[PDB]
Design a protein around this ligand. Sequence first.
Ligand SMILES: C[C@@H]1O[C@@H](O)[C@@H](O)[C@H](O)[C@@H]1O
Ligand SMILES: C[C@@H]1O[C@@H](O)[C@@H](O)[C@H](O)[C@@H]1O
Ligand SMILES: C[C@@H]1O[C@@H](O)[C@@H](O)[C@H](O)[C@@H]1O
Ligand SMILES: C[C@@H]1O[C@@H](O)[C@@H](O)[C@H](O)[C@@H]1O
Ligand SMILES: C[C@@H]1O[C@@H](O)[C@@H](O)[C@H](O)[C@@H]1O
Ligand SMILES: C[C@@H]1O[C@@H](O)[C@@H](O)[C@H](O)[C@@H]1O
Ligand SMILES: C[C@@H]1O[C@@H](O)[C@@H](O)[C@H](O)[C@@H]1O
Ligand SMILES: C[C@@H]1O[C@@H](O)[C@@H](O)[C@H](O)[C@@H]1O
Ligand SMILES: C[C@@H]1O[C@@H](O)[C@@H](O)[C@H](O)[C@@H]1O
Ligand SMILES: C[C@@H]1O[C@@H](O)[C@@H](O)[C@H](O)[C@@H]1O
Lengths: 139, 138, 140, 140, 140, 138, 138, 139, 140, 138
Amino acid sequence: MLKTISPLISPELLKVLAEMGHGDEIIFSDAHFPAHSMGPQVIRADGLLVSDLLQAIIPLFELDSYAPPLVMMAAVEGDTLDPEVERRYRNALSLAPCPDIIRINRFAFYERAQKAFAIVITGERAKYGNILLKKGVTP
Amino acid sequence: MLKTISPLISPELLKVLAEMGHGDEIIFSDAHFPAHSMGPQVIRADGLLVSDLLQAIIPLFELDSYAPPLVMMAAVEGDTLDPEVERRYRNALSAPCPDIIRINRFAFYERAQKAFAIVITGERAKYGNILLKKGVTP
Amino acid sequence: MLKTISPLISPELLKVLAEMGHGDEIIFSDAHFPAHSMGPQVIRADGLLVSDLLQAIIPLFELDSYAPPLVMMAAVEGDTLDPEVERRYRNALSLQAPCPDIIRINRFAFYERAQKAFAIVITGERAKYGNILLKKGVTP
Amino acid sequence: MLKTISPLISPELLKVLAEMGHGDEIIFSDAHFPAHSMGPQVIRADGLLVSDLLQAIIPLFELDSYAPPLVMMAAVEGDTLDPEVERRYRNALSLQAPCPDIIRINRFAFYERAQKAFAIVITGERAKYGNILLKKGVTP
Amino acid sequence: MLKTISPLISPELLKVLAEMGHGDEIIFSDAHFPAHSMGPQVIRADGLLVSDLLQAIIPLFELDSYAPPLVMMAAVEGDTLDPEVERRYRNALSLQAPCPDIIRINRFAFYERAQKAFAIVITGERAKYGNILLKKGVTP
Amino acid sequence: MLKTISPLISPELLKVLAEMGHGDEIIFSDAHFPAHSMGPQVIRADGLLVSDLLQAIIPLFELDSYAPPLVMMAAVEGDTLDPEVERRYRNALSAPCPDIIRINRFAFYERAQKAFAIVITGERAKYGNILLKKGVTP
Amino acid sequence: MLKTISPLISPELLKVLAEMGHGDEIIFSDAHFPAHSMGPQVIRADGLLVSDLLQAIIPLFELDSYAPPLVMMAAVEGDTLDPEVERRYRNALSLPCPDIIRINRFAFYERAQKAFAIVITGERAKYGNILLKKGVTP
Amino acid sequence: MLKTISPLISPELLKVLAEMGHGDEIIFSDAHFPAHSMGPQVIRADGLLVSDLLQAIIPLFELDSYAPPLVMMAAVEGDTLDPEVERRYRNALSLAPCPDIIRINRFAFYERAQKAFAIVITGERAKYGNILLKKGVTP
Amino acid sequence: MLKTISPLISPELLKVLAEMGHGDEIIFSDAHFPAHSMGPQVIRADGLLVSDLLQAIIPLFELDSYAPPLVMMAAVEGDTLDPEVERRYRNALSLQAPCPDIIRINRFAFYERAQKAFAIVITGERAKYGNILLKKGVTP
Amino acid sequence: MLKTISPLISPELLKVLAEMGHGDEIIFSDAHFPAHSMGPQVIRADGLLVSDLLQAIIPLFELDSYAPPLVMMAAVEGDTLDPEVERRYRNALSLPCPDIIRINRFAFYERAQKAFAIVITGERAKYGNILLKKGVTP
Ligand SMILES: C[C@@H]1O[C@@H](O)[C@@H](O)[C@H](O)[C@@H]1O
Ligand SMILES: C[C@@H]1O[C@@H](O)[C@@H](O)[C@H](O)[C@@H]1O
Ligand SMILES: C[C@@H]1O[C@@H](O)[C@@H](O)[C@H](O)[C@@H]1O
Ligand SMILES: C[C@@H]1O[C@@H](O)[C@@H](O)[C@H](O)[C@@H]1O
Ligand SMILES: C[C@@H]1O[C@@H](O)[C@@H](O)[C@H](O)[C@@H]1O
Ligand SMILES: C[C@@H]1O[C@@H](O)[C@@H](O)[C@H](O)[C@@H]1O
Ligand SMILES: C[C@@H]1O[C@@H](O)[C@@H](O)[C@H](O)[C@@H]1O
Ligand SMILES: C[C@@H]1O[C@@H](O)[C@@H](O)[C@H](O)[C@@H]1O
Ligand SMILES: C[C@@H]1O[C@@H](O)[C@@H](O)[C@H](O)[C@@H]1O
Ligand SMILES: C[C@@H]1O[C@@H](O)[C@@H](O)[C@H](O)[C@@H]1O
């Protein structure tokens, strides 16, 4: 734990976040995500909701302006998604407003998770609660 | 995650709990515990309370009936404990929850140095550290 | 071991099952499978039957409903497969609710698929074609 | 697996048994033993009985004749030990020739001794005091 | 780098600072300190002043209040401390509130304590006796 | 060592043989084989002949009946083989010893690169390298 | 620290510069460079300006005369460089020729994936990345 | 394999032998020795007799003159030892004669094997075929 | 060090030389070669001349006779080789019999081959183009 | 290699010397020293004379002024040193004081177990071992 920094961010994630450079991507997945088979280093955040890390990390993480900074997974046809999830993610990320969030199909998302800098799997239970953040040029 | 098992328990902690044998000790510490300098493997559980992990693990973890299975830290001289902590931990570990005994910071740290693992949590209370001793799984 | 969880599941396997997410695949091979050269981590369960493991894991493992969750190996040219195997695998998998249909794929495609699995658990099953792949779903 | 060798013996255990020399000790513990904190390398054999392993290993493992080759744990104050355990352990060990007498030592001295063992194989034996230590001899 | 947190703190140091608990100790040494032979993990901070790093971490690092949290090295017989080093350090450490009195211990006593430190950050401070140890407290 | 098992087989090779599955390939090379630059794990057996290891392993190692289980190296153009080698290897691997097929140095090395392991021996003969493919243990 | 050698160079960087041979390329990046994602080993030099290292390094590092020895990043189209960055760099390097080649952001990343090492500095100036190519030490 | 050097010495043993300095000790044990539980690095020489390595290594290994260079294990009371074993060891080591060989009790031998530089376990089947060599000042 | 074998050969190099098989290649480069970026394991031999190391290993290293076993680097346009380097190398390599003709290939071709070498020994040879590659043959 | 720095110093030795701080001790041993048995990290410098390294190292390495900075091995009782060894060493070091302390063979080993590193050279001279203690870099 450290002062002025959300105690919800583990020491290892703190390191990962700092090591990230312009353009690096990090995923905060829901609890159902196959994080461990993607390839990048995985960090567990089992007792937390994605919205928890988002609000904890946003004052530290500059979002990329050179590319879509926020990406989520699109529900497969014949499946159900929750409208509220994306709503609080935006609220958690609004320091003030945050860029629009774009959804790509689940496979496209995995494909990109495979090249990500790291993956943080949380306890988010809602379906399709996975979100990718692309880092910008930290001022 | 997994069905019928608390998702608050990370897979690595699930492995640790399963590997532990009779007499093995694990510590669930508060956020201020010097967990990483004790020696045993450390598992972070930052967003959770000690009482959260205690209740999640108890239906899987039989407590030792051959020796004191629950050990907490005695307040250092010129300092006092928060009454709310121990009572909350007992509640979480309830068969009845065995009695809890206190031992000075020296003896607690000496045992922490030799514990099977240390799970550091987001528990903010002072003296929120607790040592559990595994018994024989029935 | 732990209470409420089958003792047949090793600590490492419990970790593996918990780490797996939606779509991840895990193989429970018979004793003849070339598990160690496939690529993924290998957990040995020598002396144990695949069916005994399936029955122990099924109450915690959600099978994928987004795609066929069960894949077995088709017999190779000239071989006859023992119907007793798939019969007791489905039974073990039907512990709480009947299990989905099992599909069969060419031995080469099975290996190519084993090369991408999350993990491989090699058991004591001595019958040929006793390998079965499981695909995890979304834990309800 | 391999021909002429029990399939119940994992590859790692076969290596371990072959590496052991005269006087080296290996423990086959029950499922309750604190094997992972003792120190020596641990091989898991979850779901398997100690007696089933002993019967599989005895034809390859020479028991030491220079010192007591079999050590078991004495029950702790208040506990009763099941005579059925030591009974089937000796039977399994008597596969080709009757096995030596088994000695019992205090739980603390057993652990102190486990800390020096070559390896520890934790099995699926669920009975208490199902731990047994074997000391290798000179392969004739 | 990150926003909010000073970029003078390398990602590895940030992780270290966060893992430290109440009572844990960290050394920010001058360029002449035998950092690598003490025992704990070392983080190089060549080119940076100790006072640069103290200012960077003070907003995140609560000092121990259960014991003297600031310790520097006493000058060895024949040498004499440069009070300006302490001034700079004191000002960096007093950016939020007056820092506790800074205690000075003998060279060898300092090394002994370093052997048990959580980590050691060797900087570019070229002034003699530019070493300082910080003890962590209960984070508010 | 171990009773009923050849002491010529090191514990590590004993582990390797046991881990190998159907279709897995292992090479027993002569002393001049570039074993350490192929890729797979290498096990030294310097004082032994390939025929020594072949005979020791055969009572434990069932050979593949689904594909060519024995592969040797074809002599490079402008070079010739020593007749005594292949015949000695067949003798060592005798159920009858399946037929042996030759493949150029390129195809042999390509497979060596992907083999499960390589056991380099003290076999001094030229082209004394042989690749065994494991079958289904009965 | 060592006499005659700039104390700004960490022992690890000293080792890296010494291990580099003719043609090897090293990058001293700004704080925003995605160094850890490229592939080569990374040396953190947080808080230091690129120009500080260049000045510290140049007396020991011979620049390649067989190929352009200095490469920088061209500004993203439509954007412009801060002329002070390169002026500061040219001075630190004590720079007849050689000139500084400028390659596009991604072309720069491509070449950085194959570099000997990447030293990420505390340089906050936009496009402060510079790649140096070692020559033959006189 | 290398020219002029016994092909019976594996590459790793070659390295160990060379890394050894004045006073370092190395054990060539029989096949019954508990080499792997002693502590030092172990090298397998399964198809060889101790006498094989001895004759292969002696032209490379200078024996210590500052201390007893050759030590073997004494048979426990109530056990049998082979007179020929020590005989050929001496013959193998005689390049020309080799120092006397002294026997210490089995436990004393293990105790010393625990601090040795390395242990080479061979296929020597004879009981008490273990021998320790102490390296001298290589000329 | 050892007797019989030249003490100029570090224990790690001796091991490497012995593990090499027919066709394996090793580079003894000059002090300016980019040894560490090629890919293979590197052994430092600072201070020693390439000709010093060639004399040391020739008695133990059979050259390949199935292909040109000796390869050096051609001078880059603008440069010119110092024939005395080759003389020294030739004499060291001819201590037991006339060494095969020494072939010279382009700089980049040499690097390409180095990426696939068994190992690289970078020495203190400060003359340009002091690099030489050896291909191992069937040891008599 | 690096300009201004002796090419005799390997990159790893350069790193080690740079990491050493005030009071740390480094040993440059002769070829007969049991370096790998002592405990500290070992850097091979086969073929090089101790005096060659000392000459290469001294311009970068400040000797301790707070404690005797040079220690050597006293000859085994009844034996004698070759005066040329130390004369050669004193010259390489460009050596008012300090004097060279001589400790018995085993006392030397004891201190070598706690040294920062051991560089084993090709020095064949009896008792060519020398321990240097680092001071405060000016
Ligand atoms: C079908 C999808 O599968 C994975 O991507 C999960 O992380 C999602 O939440 C969803 O269940
Ligand atoms: C004095 C004690 O120090 C550590 O053990 C903390 O984890 C406790 O909560 C308490 O503050
Ligand atoms: C031909 C097949 O080969 C492997 O896949 C074995 O695991 C099967 O049981 C069967 O023998
Ligand atoms: C009291 C004893 O504790 C451990 O040694 C267990 O392995 C035993 O079975 C018994 O429960
Ligand atoms: C004598 C002392 O030695 C070390 O502790 C240095 O870090 C100090 O600055 C001082 O030079
Ligand atoms: C040309 C071939 O090269 C290697 O494969 C050797 O192992 C063979 O015996 C033969 O010499
Ligand atoms: C757009 C570019 O992104 C990275 O390459 C940074 O290192 C540059 O300075 C610039 O910000
Ligand atoms: C009793 C002794 O035990 C070990 O020391 C063996 O290596 C000996 O050969 C002998 O059998
Ligand atoms: C131009 C060449 O570059 C490298 O290959 C050096 O090793 C050569 O000696 C030469 O300087
Ligand atoms: C007797 C001594 O043994 C070692 O310390 C050698 O390094 C010395 O040079 C001497 O030979």
